[PDB]
Write a protein that binds this ligand. Structure first.
Ligand SMILES: C/C(=C\[C@H](C)CCCCC(=O)O)[C@@H]1O[C@@H]2C=C[C@@H]1OC(=O)\C=C/C=C\C=C\[C@H]1O[C@@H]3C[C@H]1O[C@@H](/C=C/C[C@H]1O[C@H](C[C@H](O)[C@H]1C)[C@@H](O)[C@@H](O)/C=C/CC/C=C/C2)[C@@H]3C
Ligand SMILES: [Zn+2]
Ligand SMILES: [Zn+2]
Lengths: 249, 104, 157, 95, 1114, 105, 53, 105
């Protein structure tokens, strides 16, 4: 597939048509049989993992070749969820960006990677718990807010459980969906679920993002509405010394 | 002080009534031939705000520094028309009623 | 500058026994060119009365003390059996092209102001040619042509 | 004919938005006192062409930027408290 | 001007009646001029027959029948115009001579009955419906037959589709699952096919005999031993399966529906269903998917033999192929006639149930037709169509062509049998076949691209909805005069030669004859050719046919100029283009916007009102001119007389012109002196530069007519009344109102001017005394009535040209409940080209006038003549509409040579001819300059010089001889108006026909500061005095977030919309020269919080110290 | 409650439901005061929940609260909030503006 | 600058270039009549001629 | 995601490559000029880069010259990746920092 459909496929972390098999394990390649049935083995010392192909499939490892942890066997597109678990979160990030660009580039478009990066990182915002310290053992949690517990219960109040987690490739939509602040969350496909829930828990916003404050009619937390700049006062020569002569009174 | 966080909760029947200003648990509203809101009903000036800016519904002191005035017979508070944007009402149910939200 | 027609109220009208309508009659009038004569003459008012099976044609206007219709002939309104007309057509002294929407006219009502195409000059061209006048093999012979609606002369223009 | 002296203006500040905020905050005071507040006065004040001669440009922000551009004003990020800021403000012919 | 005609191929057939689709369709559905004995099916005639041996409850015990004998079309109670005035639908009552019989006998033919009202089509092709001319567009769907198709959800497999005529049977699909099971899908219910096959009596062993050994496919269709049963029991189980509830053995009942009889599956009486089900399938057929009453048991006729081909395509010997669903031998055309008739079906269908309903409620002794028939199910079903079906557009009336072209439209959408606006891509593409029938060019640019199309000039929809193109049979060498229109399928079996092909006398002349077959372009021996194109005009639409050098225009820009012509508004000095294609006279003819003679006679009377002619002996008729009437799109249709007093008339020749017509030929615009060069950035991107000259000459100027309407209704508060007695109003405001409240004609109306006065009552309070005491003491009589008059809306205004009044009561007039009297005021407006308007040419070179220049500027020829419009070259190369360039060249000839041109499509001028004419022209143009006393001034010599350095003139030729060189290449030495100095290097200059389009800056362009805030949404919306208020979309919300524009965004979100508190504080500050804001709290916020409280839920707002704030103080 | 021309009105539509409810509460609130039949109060109580169901989220359960006349379902306190001009989304999506204007460029 | 039609100048090569292309096309059909080129082969060959020409 | 504080301080980075491996041919080529800039222009160096007798200091913002040089410097076989600061590894959570992202204002 090409064009915009690809860019969505990508930005949405979507397990495509012609997943074109990757080897789960390292090892040595062995193509076997033609026309009748086509299968490929990547068997190292110990394990012998077998990858049955369509037969029509245009595989791109010839017999004998040595192979890599998550290396493509077959051609086609690659599942970004299969890549996550086989070969980590960075390798994922690096696939997404470089593939998304593979199209804008291929066409005519020139844009900087950082944009795509900024977005891609958000696809990696959350992680699911395995064996917790405080909360229930299954919940999805923001990568940072788990460090708010991991490197918290292993320093000052050290002990209990560091909270083990798993890397969690969220598609662009899904990730947008699971977004802390209820105000923002409300604007998506089912506003009731949000509010119902957020009402039960004394949930609070804090209104960090923008989608939030525009909803309220508040002054956007960016540009001139950035905490880092909007408090800036300007005092004016004679105003300053005259303001100084009523301070020691 | 200035807002910095917003927190949603649930509504204690003691609050829903604390908000309320009056009870619209009484008939149904808007005169059509005149334009007066019907007494103790979904627009009753007596319970929300004066439909007109300051002023009562018959004749009182259209002042500014007197703060909170209620009339002779009718019960309208002489204090800006924006009020009707914000004053809450309530219907006191006779029995139960579940928020369908927390139900379905 | 504007017109009165007898039983006409706006431009988008028609007159019976007149193949023309007010619009098309006006597009005609525009072309009419009146030479003035008295220079005191700032603005006259021409009057044309027409009747019966007649081709009304500028020159069918009423002659006036200080007015010379420069392009008689020129169609105004083909009239069929039973056609009247009576026009009060006002000629003003102006310059350049003044759209009817700009000036307006209060020669009574049902007046329909008319777009003003004043310039007597009809077209101009000029010729920079080689001369025979005993100096350089690089001099100039100018000749401006000038065309006008005979109301003012090339020479005067 | 981009903003007059803006390259200089962007360099005056850390985050550009700060620039806006100052221009604004100044064009603010410079308005809420009839311009009896200028630092630039003499023959520095910005002006206007007309069917008439040079009149005092009536654009606060335009003035604000010319003003700032002369180093004659200061950006307190937190210098002089907001409670005392509206104090000695309404003083030198405000009403 | 004398006209020069171009090119060979002598048009064997003239274009067919054009609106043929519409006009001849109806006729054959309404045999109103044919005795009710003949009337051979189809149309209304059949739609009765399809319904009308109507029984009553029970099968042969209770009496009463009621049988159709013949229908009678009534007569129009209101003239074509009364209708459009009184707001009615041009109709005629329809009567049925029905006949109800009994069990004791009694043939009662009640003297017809009124079953409803039938809308009559005009001469035009168009309808009139509740005023307003509507057009029913012809739709296309799958031509009934049997199809198969591939299966989108399971690869390497197939489905089978049994599709009957629309509203004449159900959609039966056959598909085999991963189970093996074959499954019938009908009426969105799915059971195992076998069950049906069991009913039609197939036996476990007959099936294997018939359907085995290709594939292990039967094996699945088998195993249901459980119901490989008693064909009667099969029937019961299948009836329980199709209609859950009633479980008896009269399952023959329903099973007779998707079986025999002309109730449902009537895939044809004996036509394109049976026929094509035979060739594809295993031949030999009658007319229904199976036959029932063979003697009292069903006998299969299509189901199995389909299944055969279904299996025989899941492995299958060659010859058992898939089917091209997009072939026009698979696509049918529902014309008006049929849709209108299909709607009778719905009507009569309903009318029957409600007879059988009244056969049960009534005593059989007295029941009569008239007492059984209701007259409202036929009406409501057929009122609904002409009024509320998607296929019934208004009527694109901008210009003659636009209208004409409307009627010849074709669309795959529409009702039921029609794809949605979210399906079909294989459909959209111009499939091979469309050739000569549908246009490869006319479709709208986005959304419904390909879902709508133009019927082709020579195309004809036929007998059963197949479009047929004319061809020339060539008897092995000689091109015969015989012309054979033939199907999209009846074409894939011949070898047809192109028209571009030469000839000697009456026969093919060259040795390597070009032609196609099936689809492939093929080179062929002369003797090996069978048929011949009648013209290239075959291939394209009416509008696509009007582009004089189409051959040279890239097909994209062609489609732009094919439409766009349809946007071209008519002009006061409208003029037929300098370079024509032929149909321009005929387009105007078949549109009937122009008035033409009836029978060669002699004109007697002629004025702006009437043309009256004495036709040779045959009495005397007066033809009234429609004059400054207002087209649907506000355009101003108006006829002008083109004929003099006491003149003999040509058979049927122009008595009068239409709106976009010049002496009978099409006049969508002006031809005008053009120069293709850059100006000074004024023709940047697509912008055009104009010469004021054009305004002085009132060229591109056009008369638009608005239409205003007001109603007076009755009210719980009293009647809305149309007085001129409007309270408080100064007798100067009332000045233009007649004693009724309605503006005078010829009244000049500016915005905010009463157009129709109207007082409404309204009870907005009661005045408490003191005020009542004050009222008398100071005179002005307290009034019971508010102002609420009509008034001209901001932006509008012009001359009042006609009023219209309709009163509840008044004869034919029927306004909606409440509405009592309606007033209509019509307002004309001369327009005139304007910066912001858009001119286009035939080759799709659209663009906006961006600067008018006074003639002092403007490039000018040496003779002095200025050009008119300055068109930018940079426009040409990227779009590849080279025809415009050629058109300028031929045009330049014309100017000098004094002629217009007819250049056919793919048959018009060639350069050889064009340059010959440019030659002839320069010879007169320069012959003048010499004969007047001149020649080649320094300015041209300085150009002509560098002109050869540019290899554009032959060196070693005279400046005069070099001038011609250029004039022939079509360029000239232009002279800069601003500065007499010549443009360095020659410019192509010439006459180009250019149109003024539907859009104008007048109607656009709006600007608000403040005012009318809605009481519902509280954001500015609508404007009685001041107007408008622009939307800030979510896309713009982004931009402001993208820029750092905090306050600016917040401005757009508060003080210029809902925030009452804020806007008020802001506007009270701007009035007083204050800074504006410090907006207390975004209203948005308050609103939401409260809108939350209302739903329970506290929503605490809290500062950084985490305590509460109260964003309200009250 | 806004008056369309004459004595025709534009009632909020939520206002409607907010009565449907006060009529039940006052019916199933009278019954109980004098004359309390078992089965009768039951259905009235089944109605008063259902009436609050409507004000909150009309569309649910299955039967939508129609209006004497049309079958259009009429908006609930949920819809006020449930996007598209619905309080949460009105801002980031719409809003007509007070110093604007357009024209051909 | 302007675009006149003679500004869409065709190269003196095109005629011959197509005569040449024509000739080679005759040599392709003949080569299939024998049997050198399969149905497909000969198509490909015809297509790859025009692409080049 | 908003630039919220100049530099989070973290010391991971990204290694923008200047060569590409064609899975079809297994071969490596130095990537299209255009794309290189799109990975580098306006980036901040994560760790120093020395090549062609030039040291690029830690946390230097790379101009278009710099990139252009870096590509020259890769063809002379001295540079294969560029250790660059990126939003992918910035550590301010609720937005990238100033020193990540870097530039493209
Ligand atoms: C989209 C559509 C109709 C639209 C209103 C018009 C088509 C828009 C495409 C375009 O102009 O680019 C569909 O049309 C029909 C059936 C289902 C679809 O219904 C639809 O999706 C939508 C509406 C269908 C019918 C609506 C009928 C009524 O709506 C209004 C009053 C009734 O008539 C409508 C008038 C339509 C005439 C149009 O005519 C066109 C120009 C303008 O679009 C209009 C003047 C002309 O160029 C004309 O040649 C085009 C005709 C379109 C032929 C399509 C027929 C199938 C008018 C907009
Ligand atoms: Zn009172
Ligand atoms: Zn960082």
């Amino acid at each position: 597939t090409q064009g915009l459909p690809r860019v969505i496929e990508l930005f949405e972390a979507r397990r495509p048509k012609a997943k074109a098999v990757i080897s789960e394990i390292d090892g040595v390649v062995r193509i076997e049989e033609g026309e009748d049935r086509l299968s490929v083995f990547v068997e190292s010392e110990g394990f012998s993992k077998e990858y049955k192909l369509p037969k029509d499939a245009r595989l791109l490892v010839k017999d004998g070749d040595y192979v890599e942890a998550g290396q493509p066997l077959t051609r086609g597109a690659i599942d970004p969820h299969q890549l996550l678990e086989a070969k980590g979160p960075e390798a994922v990030e690096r696939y997404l960006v470089d593939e998304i660009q593979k199209v804008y580039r291929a066409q005519g478009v020139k844009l900087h990677d950082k944009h795509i990066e900024i977005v891609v990182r958000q696809m990696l915002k959350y992680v699911e718990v395995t064996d917790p310290g405080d909360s229930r053992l299954l919940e999805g949690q923001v990568l940072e807010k788990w460090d708010v517990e991991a490197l918290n219960e292993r320093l000052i109040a050290e002990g209990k459980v560091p909270v083990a987690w798993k890397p969690l490739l969220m598609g662009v939509t899904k990730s947008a969906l699971s977004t802390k602040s209820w105000l923002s969350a409300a604007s998506f496909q089912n506003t009731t679920h949000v509010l119902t829930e957020a009402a039960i828990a004394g949930k609070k916003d804090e209104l960090i993002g923008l989608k939030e404050n525009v909803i309220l009619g508040r002054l956007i937390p960016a540009g001139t509405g950035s905490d880092f700049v909007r408090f800036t006062q300007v005092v004016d020569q004679r105003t300053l010394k005259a303001i100084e002569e009523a301070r020691k009174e | 002080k200035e807002v910095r966080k917003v927190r949603i909760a649930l509504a204690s029947p003691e609050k829903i009534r604390s908000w309320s200003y009056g009870e619209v648990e009484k008939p149904e509203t808007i005169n059509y031939r005149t334009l007066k809101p019907e007494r103790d009903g979904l627009f009753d000036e007596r319970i929300f705000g004066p439909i007109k800016d300051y002023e009562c519904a018959c004749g009182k002191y259209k002042r500014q520094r007197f703060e909170g005035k209620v009339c002779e017979r009718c019960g309208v508070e002489v204090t800006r028309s924006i009020v009707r944007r914000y004053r809450m009402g309530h219907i006191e149910l006779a029995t139960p009623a579940a928020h369908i939200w927390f139900v379905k | 500058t504007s017109v009165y027609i007898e039983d006409v109220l706006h431009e988008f009208s028609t007159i019976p026994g007149v193949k023309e309508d007010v619009v098309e009659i006006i597009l005609n009038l525009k072309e009419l060119v009146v030479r003035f004569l008295d220079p005191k003459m700032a603005s006259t008012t021409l009057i044309l009365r027409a009747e019966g099976p007649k081709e009304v044609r500028a020159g069918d206007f009423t002659p006036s003390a200080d007015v010379e219709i420069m392009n008689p002939d020129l169609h105004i309104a083909t009239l069929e059996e039973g056609g009247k007309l009576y026009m009060e057509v006002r000629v003003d002294r102006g310059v350049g092209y003044v759209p009817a929407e700009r000036h307006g006219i209060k020669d009574r009502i049902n007046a329909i102001p008319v777009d003003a195409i004043f310039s007597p000059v009809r077209r101009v061209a000029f010729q920079v040619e080689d001369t025979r006048l005993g100096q350089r093999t690089d001099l100039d012979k100018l000749t401006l042509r000038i065309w006008t609606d005979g109301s003012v002369t090339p020479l005067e223009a | 004919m981009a903003e007059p002296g803006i390259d200089k203006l962007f360099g005056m500040v850390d985050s550009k938005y700060r620039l806006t905020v100052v221009v604004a905050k100044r064009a603010q005071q410079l308005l809420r006192h009839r311009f009896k507040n200028t630092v630039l006065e003499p023959e520095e004040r910005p002006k206007m062409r007309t069917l008439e001669g040079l009149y005092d440009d009536p654009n606060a922000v335009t003035w604000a930027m010319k003003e700032l551009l002369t180093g004659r004003l200061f950006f307190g990020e937190n210098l002089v408290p907001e409670d005392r800021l509206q104090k000695e403000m309404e003083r030198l012919y405000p009403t | 001007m004398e006209i020069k005609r171009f090119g060979r191929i002598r048009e064997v057939i003239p274009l067919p009646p054009l609106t043929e689709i519409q006009v001849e369709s109806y006729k054959k559905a309404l045999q109103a001029d044919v005795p009710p004995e003949k009337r051979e099916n189809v149309g209304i005639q059949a739609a009765f027959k399809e319904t009308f041996p109507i029984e009553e409850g029970d099968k042969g015990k209770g009496g009463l029948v009621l049988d159709f004998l013949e229908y009678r079309i009534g007569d129009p109670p209101f003239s074509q115009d009364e209708c459009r005035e009184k707001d009615l639908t041009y109709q005629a009552p329809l009567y049925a001579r029905l006949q109800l019989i009994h069990k004791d006998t009694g043939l009662i033919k009640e003297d017809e009955v009124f079953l409803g009202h039938l809308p009559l089509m005009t001469e035009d092709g168009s309808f009139i419906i509740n005023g307003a001319d509507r057009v029913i567009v012809s739709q296309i769907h799958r031509s009934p037959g049997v199809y198969f198709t591939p299966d989108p959800a399971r690869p390497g497999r197939y489905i089978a589709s049994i599709i009957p005529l629309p509203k004449r049977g159900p959609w039966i699909d056959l598909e085999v699952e991963a189970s093996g099971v074959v499954t019938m899908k009908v009426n969105k219910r799915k059971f195992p096919l076998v069950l049906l096959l069991r009913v039609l009596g197939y036996d476990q062993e007959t099936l294997v005999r018939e359907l085995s050994a290709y594939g292990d496919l039967v094996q699945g269709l088998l195993d249901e031993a459980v119901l490989a049963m008693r064909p009667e029991e099969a029937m019961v189980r299948l009836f329980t399966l199709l209609r859950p509830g009633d479980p008896p053995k009269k399952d023959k009942a329903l099973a007779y529906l998707f079986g025999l009889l002309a109730d449902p599956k009537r895939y044809d009486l004996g036509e394109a269903g049976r026929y094509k089900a035979e060739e594809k399938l295993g031949v030999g057929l009658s007319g229904r998917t199976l036959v029932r009453f063979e003697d009292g048991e069903f006998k299969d006729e299509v189901f199995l033999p389909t299944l055969r081909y279904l299996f025989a395509l899941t492995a299958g010997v060659p010859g058992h192929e898939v089917d091209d669903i997009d072939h026009l031998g698979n696509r049918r055309i529902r014309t008006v006639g049929e849709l209108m008739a299909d709607q009778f079906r719905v009507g009569l269908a309903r009318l029957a149930r409600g007879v059988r309903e009244r056969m049960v409620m009534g005593s059989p002794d007295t029941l009569t037709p008239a007492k059984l028939v209701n007259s409202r199910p036929l009406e409501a079903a057929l009122r609904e169509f002409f009024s509320r079906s998607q296929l019934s557009q208004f009527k694109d009336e901008t210009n003659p062509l636009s209208s004409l072209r409307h009627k010849r439209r074709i669309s795959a959408l529409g009702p039921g049998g029609l794809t949605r606006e979210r399906a079909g891509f294989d459909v959209r593409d111009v499939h091979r076949t469309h050739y000569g029938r549908i246009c490869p060019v006319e479709t709208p640019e986005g959304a419904n691209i390909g879902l709508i199309t133009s019927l082709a000039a020579y195309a004809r929809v036929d007998a059963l909805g197949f479009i047929r193109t004319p061809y020339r049979r060539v008897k092995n060498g000689v091109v015969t005069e015989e012309v054979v229109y033939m199907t999209a399928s009846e074409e894939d079996r011949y070898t047809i030669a192109q028209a571009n092909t030469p000839l000697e006398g009456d026969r093919i002349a060259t040795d390597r004859v070009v032609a196609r077959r099936r689809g492939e372009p093929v080179i062929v021996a002369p003797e090996e050719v069978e048929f011949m194109d009648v013209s290239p005009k075959q291939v394209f639409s009416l509008n696509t046919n009007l582009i004089p050098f189409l051959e040279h225009d890239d097909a994209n820009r062609a489609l732009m100029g094919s439409n766009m012509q349809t946007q071209a508004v008519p002009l006061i000095r409208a003029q037929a283009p300098v370079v024509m294609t032929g149909l321009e006279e005929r387009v105007v003819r078949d549109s009937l916007a122009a008035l033409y003679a009836e029978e060669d006679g002699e004109v007697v009377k002629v004025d702006g009102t009437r043309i009256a002619v004495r036709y040779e002996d045959g009495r005397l008729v007066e033809h009234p001119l429609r004059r400054y009437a207002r087209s649907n799109q506000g355009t101003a249709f108006d006829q002008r007389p083109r004929v003099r007093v006491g003149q003999r008339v040509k058979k049927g020749d122009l008595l009068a012109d239409g709106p976009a017509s010049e002496e009978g030929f099409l006049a969508l615009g002006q031809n005008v002196l053009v120069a293709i060069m850059p100006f000074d950035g004024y023709n940047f991107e697509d912008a055009i530069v104009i010469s004021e000259e054009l305004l002085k000459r009132d060229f591109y100027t056009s008369i638009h007519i608005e239409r205003y309407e007001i109603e007076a209704r009755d009210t719980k508060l009293g009647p809305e009344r149309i007085t001129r007695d409007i309270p408080h109003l100064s007798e100067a405001a009332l000045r233009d109102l007649d004693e009724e409240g309605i503006v005078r004609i010829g009244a000049e109306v500016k915005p905010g001017d009463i157009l129709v006065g109207r007082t409404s009552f309204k009870g907005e309070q009661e005045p408490s005394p003191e005020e009542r005491l004050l009222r008398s003491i100071f005179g002005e009589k307290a009034r019971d009535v508010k102002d609420t008059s009509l008034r001209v809306p901001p932006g509008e205004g012009g001359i009042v040209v006609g009023r219209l009044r309709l009163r509840r009561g008044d004869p034919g007039v029927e306004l909606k409940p409440g509405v009592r009297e309606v007033v209509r005021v019509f307002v004309a407006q001369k327009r005139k080209l304007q910066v912001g308007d858009k001119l286009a040419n035939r080759h799709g070179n659209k663009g906006v006038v961006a600067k008018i220049l006074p003639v002092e500027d403007m490039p000018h020829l040496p003779d002095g003549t200025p050009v008119d419009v300055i068109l930018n070259p940079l426009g040409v190369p990227s779009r590849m509409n080279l025809g415009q360039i050629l058109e300028t060249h031929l045009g330049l000839a014309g100017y000098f040579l004094g002629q217009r041109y007819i250049s056919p499509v793919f048959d018009g001028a060639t350069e050889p001819e064009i340059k010959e004419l440019l030659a002839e022209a320069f010879n007169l143009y320069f012959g003048k300059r010499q004969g007047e006393g001149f020649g080649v001034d320094k300015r041209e010599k300085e150009v002509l010089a560098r002109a050869e350095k540019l290899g554009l003139v032959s060196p070693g030729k005279s400046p005069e001889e070099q001038l011609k060189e250029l004039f022939d290449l079509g360029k000239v030495v232009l002279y800069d108006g601003r500065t007499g100095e010549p443009f360095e290097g020659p410019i192509v200059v010439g006459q180009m026909f250019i149109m003024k389009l539907y859009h104008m800056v007048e109607d656009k362009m709006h600007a608000r500061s403040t005012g009318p805030y809605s009481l519902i949404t509280q954001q500015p919306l609508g404007g009685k005095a001041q107007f408008g208020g622009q939307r800030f979309g979510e896309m713009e919300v982004w931009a402001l977030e993208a820029y750092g524009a905090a306050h600016t965004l917040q401005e757009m979100l508060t003080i210029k919309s809902d925030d009452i508190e804020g806007r008020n504080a802001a506007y009270q500050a701007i009035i007083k020269g204050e800074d504006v804001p410090e907006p207390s709290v975004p209203e948005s916020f308050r609103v939401l919080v409260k809108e939350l409280q209302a739903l329970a839920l506290d929503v605490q707002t809290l500062d950084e110290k985490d305590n509460p704030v109260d964003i309200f103080e009250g | 409650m806004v008056q369309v021309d004459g004595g025709r009105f534009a009632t909020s539509d939520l206002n409607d439901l907010y009565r449907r409810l006060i009529n039940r509460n006052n019916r199933l609130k009278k019954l109980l005061a004098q004359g309390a039949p078992e089965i009768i109060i039951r259905n009235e109580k089944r109605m008063l929940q259902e009436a609050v169901d409507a004000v909150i989220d009309n569309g649910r359960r299955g039967s939508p609260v129609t209006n004497p006349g049309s079958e259009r379902p009429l908006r609930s306190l949920t819809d006020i909030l449930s996007g598209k001009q619905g309080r949460f989304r009105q801002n980031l999506l719409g809003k007509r503006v007070d110093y604007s204007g357009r024209s051909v460029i | 600058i302007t675009i006149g039609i003679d500004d869409a100048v065709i190269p003196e090569e095109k005629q011959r270039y197509l005569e040449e292309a024509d000739r080679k096309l005759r040599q392709i059909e003949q080569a299939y009549e024998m049997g050198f080129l399969t149905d497909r082969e000969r198509y490909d060959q015809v297509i790859q001629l025009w692409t080049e020409t | 995601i908003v630039v919220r504080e100049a530099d989070c301080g973290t010391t991971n980075y990204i290694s923008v490559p200047l060569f590409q491996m064609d899975e079809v041919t297994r071969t490596l080529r130095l990537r299209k000029r255009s794309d290189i800039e799109s990975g580098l222009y306006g980036r901040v160096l994560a760790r120093e880069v020395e090549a062609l007798g030039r040291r690029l200091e830690e946390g230097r913002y790379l101009s278009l010259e710099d990139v252009h040089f870096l590509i020259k410097a890769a063809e002379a076989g001295e540079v294969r990746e560029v250790p660059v600061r990126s939003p992918l590894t910035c550590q301010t959570r609720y937005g990238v920092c100033q020193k990540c992202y870097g530039y493209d204002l």
